[PDB]
A paper describes a structure:
Centrioles are complex microtubule (MT) based structures that are required for the formation of centrosomes and cilia/flagella. The protein kinase recruits STIL/[name]/SAS-5 and [name] to a single site on the side of the mother centriole where they assemble with CPAP/Sas-4 into a cartwheel structure that helps to establish the ninefold symmetry of the centriole. Here we show that [name]/STIL proteins also homo-oligomerise and that mutations that perturb the homo-oligomerisation of fly [name] in vitro also strongly perturb centriole assembly in vivo. Thus, [name] homo-oligomerisation alone appears unable to drive efficient cartwheel assembly in vivo if [name] is unable to homo-oligomerise.
Author numbering:
A (entry chain A), B (entry chain B): 9 to 216
Write the structure that this text describes.
Amino acid sequence: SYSAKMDYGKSVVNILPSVEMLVNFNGDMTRSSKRSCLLYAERVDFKELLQLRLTEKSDQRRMYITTVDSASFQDLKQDQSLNVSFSGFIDNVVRMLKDCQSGKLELHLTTRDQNLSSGREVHDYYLQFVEIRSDKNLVHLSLPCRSAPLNTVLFYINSMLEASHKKQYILEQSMQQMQAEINAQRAHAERLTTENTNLREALAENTR
Amino acid sequence: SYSAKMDYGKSVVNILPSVEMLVNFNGDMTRSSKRSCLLYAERVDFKELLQLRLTEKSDQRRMYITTVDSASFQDLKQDQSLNVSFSGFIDNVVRMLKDCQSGKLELHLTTRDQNLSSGREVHDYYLQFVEIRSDKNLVHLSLPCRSAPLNTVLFYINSMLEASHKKQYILEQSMQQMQAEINAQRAHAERLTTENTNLREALAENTR
């Protein structure tokens, strides 16, 4: 299947550092679940394009992707009566993700209520930012979310693997240039300090 | 898309440590190529099952899998006039892989010559162990190789990522305490040189 990949190199901007988040899975609390996920939020610098990736921590192959561009954003702006520009939208989204971290908000992943007569749609989920209230819970933003197809998933997990390997290389080489200190400084310490243990005996004969 | 996955837990045995290998891609040297690959060789302990995985170093999503079980092994034994048991076969394959490492042998990945009128097959390649000779090159073993389907590739790359994460956590957690330890223990100079620099002067002053 087809899905937007954020393969834009240096133009990819992390709008928020990747974090672990407790996410709600679906509507009815008797049939729902709360799972530990990993959220990745990034945009493109040269064009209006935002992608939010949600992975289940236990199996990052379980990926849910939300991609909103200019047109999509216009549809969202109309449907949800948003009073912001694309940049202000990004600001709001970031802010709300941080609120979901602090617990001020809750991130939900709701199955879209589908049936045979409503035709067919690409997005089978909604990524919702919900405020728990004592009168009625309030949904601040509802984004069309998709179950990532294998090609895209494989792209992100492969990329993550490569990044992990590069990081391991940087770590082990940052250890390697430092690993000379552990073989030089203790060899300068435990073997050459004996000239001090024997110097006191030299001082002993001329101590009076 | 189906392919055998070595998801047999502790029963999975590395018959050979994962290594980098230069592999030949296809027959006619005017249309062939030589690429750096990573070879993974593993078997199951409780049943006769061998899998060789070949990934292109530059992109491990490019995966070629050879899976041999009992029946398959009987077919190879007949067709190639092999005079060994399954265990002895595993021994020979390991030996030959080591020889490919040393340069005594060459590992080829040859496209099977297909056309519309021939019987359709799942395996579109041959993993061949070729001995370069001055009379005529000799092919010691020819295994039916398959181009790994997405599901399987995603399984192995995801697995590799998880293992990589475990390795990173173990590495940096074992590294940080020594990065502080070298900063506490390097002072051993300034800690013992007061006992050294003033005692050299005491010894200079007593026999002055």
